[model samples]
Target: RYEYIVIGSEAAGVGLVRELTAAGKKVLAVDKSKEKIELLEDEGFDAVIADPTDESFYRSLDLEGVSAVLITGSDDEFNLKILKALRSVSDVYAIVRVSSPKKKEEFEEAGANLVVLVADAVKQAFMDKIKKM
Candidate 1:
């Protein structure tokens, strides 16, 4: 069974678990928010309440076959930092959500396999389609 670590408890994080688990994969949805954790439990998501900012917390998890790590928290700097830390440990793929457009290049350079501009990318894509049309 492939395992996934989603490091956020917001819409994106919750959605990741819902989709992945729907596909019959094992998902470990994590976040610092107790409210979000409760919501995930309500939705039947296999979630662990924890903070991604703490490396010790991450190490404490049983990540034997974790396929990939996705950091989708609101804090761009924190996400980037966590992604950097995770990259050094395992060969697993990383997807980091970046809120700042200016920080994208820095995030990529820091070894993020995939940098997702959570807010800006959506707007950029909408504008790009309009410009094309």
Candidate 2:
């Protein structure tokens, strides 16, 4: 991983790239598929193709120099494994997206600084929307 690396699967990751860029953050978009990385590369974004779940590949990423790691895969098991590995290697700030609240404890214990719950976020959004009506 390079400075402020972001590992994501699909559209959500793409959206994060835009927002991170807009906020003046340097992002290296990492996806397992070539197409996604190529799309980002073609747009002048720094991107790489890698299976982030791999034990060895991720271990050699030189995460120590990286300031932060943001994961957008939305799989709790996947995210938790990465988070634990990241902490074991470096003290990088980890932001992870999880599918539900059930795993937040494990997520935090594994060194996730911020955990985004997809379902609760949408639920909160709907709740707030109805309140304004």
Candidate 3:
């Protein structure tokens, strides 16, 4: 239904969806948590409870209007699974978050166009800022 889809209900993920929707863009917000989906729906999001890694789920969606995907989950393996799933389907832009540096190559090799290592990036940014000062 929407072009931009975010595949997590975390604070950051939810916030981005809300912001994009507020800017007059159609957003599809997805999460495996039913409660989170209900809450997001109340907030005017088209939230659904489904595993992003499921090929059937992606196939169900009409991707003609879809442009990008964001895959984030509390579990690193789950997050990569979603990314890999997206890769197997369409050519949508994807951003994936990994749990550790060890899983970095796995996500990349899984075909995630943009892979983010949450812990390492934060630490590196903090150290880099301190070094500059």
Candidate 4:
């Protein structure tokens, strides 16, 4: 049973995996790229190489024991597809990353427990700096 299943294995996903592992969380990071998966494994992450958007791939996962699923794929549409696939298999909390604000509602509608907007987060960070100044 894993505490977190993170899909993507890209920059954002890798960073999250590292942080979670450092904090003593059991995380399984997935990516379609074999190279990325190997790198993740080399970094001490339990990683898998598979397409999360494929329903069969999703079914193959032991998600029933997972506490949460985090999708940080670069493509917004792909992330939504992954979110839907994850929802179809388990009721675990799912968090997705959205590249655009306009698609936030769509991601939420697709059963994402939380939709994080990359642009919005950067904006918020800048706003915080402005407030401090």
The clash numbers for all candidates, in the given order, read 0, 0, 0, 0
Q: Which structure among the candidates has the greatest lDDT?
A: 4
Model 1 agreement with the true structure over 18-74: per-residue lDDT tens digits: 898889888888887888888888877777778676767766766657778888888
- What lDDT, from 0 to 1, does candidate 4 have? 0.88
By lDDT, the better pick of 2 and 4 is 4
Among these predicted structures, which one has the highest TM-score? 4
lDDT of 3 by residue, 52-133 (tens): 8898888888876777787766679788778778778877778787878888888878878887788876899999999999
**Which residue pairs collide in model 3, if any?**
none
Clashing pairs in 4: none
- lDDT for 5 in candidate 2 is 85
TM-score of each: 0.80, 0.81, 0.83, 0.91
Q: Write the per-residue lDDT of candidate 4 for residues 43-101, one digit (tens) a residue.
A: 77899988897878877877777888889888987888788877777778998899989
Candidate 4 has a TM-score of 0.91
Off by over 4 Å in 2: 1-3, 54-67, 131-133
Which stretches of candidate 1 lie above 4 Å from their native place? 123-133
Question: Which wins on TM-score, candidate 2 or candidate 4?
Answer: 4
The ten-residue window of minimal lDDT in model 2 covers: 51-60
